[PDB]
Amino acid sequence: TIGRISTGSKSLDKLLGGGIETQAITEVFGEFGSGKTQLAHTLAVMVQLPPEEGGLNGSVIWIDTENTFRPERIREIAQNRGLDPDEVLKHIYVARAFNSNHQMLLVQQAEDKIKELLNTDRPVKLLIVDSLTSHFRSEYIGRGALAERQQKLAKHLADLHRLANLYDIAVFVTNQVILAHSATLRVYLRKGKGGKRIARLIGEAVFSITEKGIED
Ligand SMILES: Nc1nc2c(ncn2[C@@H]2O[C@H](COP(=O)(O)OP(=O)(O)OP(=O)(O)O)[C@@H](O)[C@H]2O)c(=O)[nH]1
Ligand SMILES: [Mg+2]
User: Fold this and answer.
1) Where along the chain is ATP bound?
2) 213 C-alpha vs ligand 1 centroid, how far in Å?
């Protein structure tokens, strides 16, 4: 069965069919400030809620490539949704990827953690890669790079799709914006009037960024 993780926004959840899915890679893409990292921090709390509150009683693996994970933003979102900020942080396993090759290795390490927690009452249910593409865009540049970059990212995305399907995990990846993509679901995020963010699947959802992370 596909699990669904609430985003915190009822509007965005509706657009997604109820939340971010397990057994799928969901890519959010959009310009600087569009909400990609804030959505990631909000899902890393939401997935820890029980299912009747929109979570999967799950743990989180987060591969951070631009040093934008903020443990205090997690604690705030958790505190404000009525969860213990330190227990929520204990269930997020963060690793910094130093380059695209290290990023690829970290996905194989993630399988070790996933296997370990599979017999626990908080199995990994969410794997975040923020940003999926930043290192690949820095490292593979110039004539011949398009093909090489796309082949390396296809292998990385295949590794991630295997973990999502084999272990019933939601994979959530971000991309800052003609080239091919292989996410299961692609969600375009942009800034709207009045501080809102607007999401479109590639209706529209509208959400805010608040003390609770993301919400309508
Ligand atoms: N309340 C709160 N808002 C924040 C915080 N950090 C960022 N924001 C707001 O959230 C908006 C969305 O930011 P992000 O999710 O980081 O943007 P992004 O899409 O990841 O951007 P890039 O990483 O630059 O591609 C920002 O414009 C800020 O207005 C925070 O720690 N607390
Ligand atoms: Mg970001």
Assistant:
1) 30-37
2) 10
Reduced DSSP (H G I as helix, E B as strand, rest coil) percent helix, strand, coil of the chain, to 5? 40, 25, 35
DSSP H or E run through 74: helix 71-80
Q: Which atom of ligand 1 is nearest to the CA of 38?
A: 15
Q: Contact, 19 vs 190, CB < 8 A?
A: no
Count of Cβ atoms closer than 10 Å to residue 172 Cβ:
30
Q: Which residues surround ligand 2, an ion (CB under 5 A)?
A: 36-37, 68
Separation between Cα atoms, residue 43 and residue 56, nearest integer Å: 11
Q: Set out the domains of the chain in order of their start, with CATH numbers.
A: 1-216 (3.40.50.300)
Measured from the CB, is residue 36 less than 6 Å from ligand 1?
A: yes
Structure tokens at 198: 């607007």
103 Cβ closer than 6 Å to some ligand 1 atom: no
Q: Which resolution, in Å, applies to this structure?
A: 1.6
Cα–Cα distance, 198 to 195 (Å, whole number) = 10
38 lines ligand 1 (CB under 6 A): yes
Instruction: Locate 132 and state its tokens.
Output: 């999926």
For the record, the structure tokens of 22 come out as: 């397990």
Size (the chain), residues: 216
Q: Binding residue per annotation — 207?
A: no
